């Protein structure tokens, strides 16, 4: 049972690694190492070397059995552009592969993750296949020569096996992935947000075809071994400003992004509720929302997380992951998730 959490290095000033309740996890990720174009000598952002080195010893103090991985990349266009440049250049791929493995060993990580959003269209998938194949082979070679336990290899995937469901340009090669990777981190969230003129469940388990279950079903139908799938669960909500303060349910008209720029951490949502927002559990989508005056936020709460984790167990998945652990300071949701699988 994989109990996974992502810690973003950006949050160090407010949530250093010492604050993570690592007893609630089997695997913790450091996000993110940079691709470092044009050499593609992968590295942590310069100036963060001590933070990266201290990450694993720090989290292991509370739960020595916890393992760590370092994730390379991130969301956003600059990273996507860099992966696209990298993967087309055989020499650059070689430099990336060598430096990534060295990076993990340097800082005492137990594995590598690739966060590439997304390997599309078809050319980009084909070139990503080249990178990942070379990385898998080099990881196995390093394990043999060094004698050390083999580095884990994972990657971020879109919620759905097809890129994209409404207009298929390419798709994740599930057999390839199952053979080369230990698991994939299914990003089953950000289905809805302030970019839409109606409130919705940003990480709906079910409903619409833009849901966690439909996405999971797509990977399974394509032939992914269920244990290779790790279900992502957000520790943040998506927020809207309401057009009318008396229309407060799902599907209510909206006039733009709520705080903070359309996203609120779970901890901030708890403050929102304690400050007078009304919490509602929506059984239709398996999700929560909260509202006060003109602010509306959709998220996952104690009930929906427990339901999603049980869903993952019933679907025989490898486990679950949280993005991102700094956003639930009291580890409310990681606690219920861990208790649910156990």
Automatic annotation (TrEMBL):
UniProt-recorded Gene Ontology molecular function terms: chitin binding; chitinase activity
SMART domains according to UniProt: Glyco_18
Asked whether the keyword Hydrolase is assigned, the reply is yes
Q: Which residues form the GH18 domain?
A: 1-342
InterPro entries the UniProt entry points to: Chitinase_II/V-like_cat (IPR011583), Chitinase_insertion_sf (IPR029070), GH (IPR017853), Glyco_hydro18_cat (IPR001223), Glycosyl_Hydrlase_18 (IPR050314)
Record GO biological process: carbohydrate metabolic process; chitin catabolic process
| One GO location term (cellular component) | extracellular region
- Keywords in alphabetical order, please: Glycoprotein, Glycosidase, Hydrolase, Signal
Family per record: Belongs to the glycosyl hydrolase 18 family. Chitinase class V subfamily.
According to UniProt, the name of this protein is Chitinase A
Give the species this sequence originates from.
Answer: Cycas revoluta
Could you tell me the gene encoding this protein?
A: crchiA
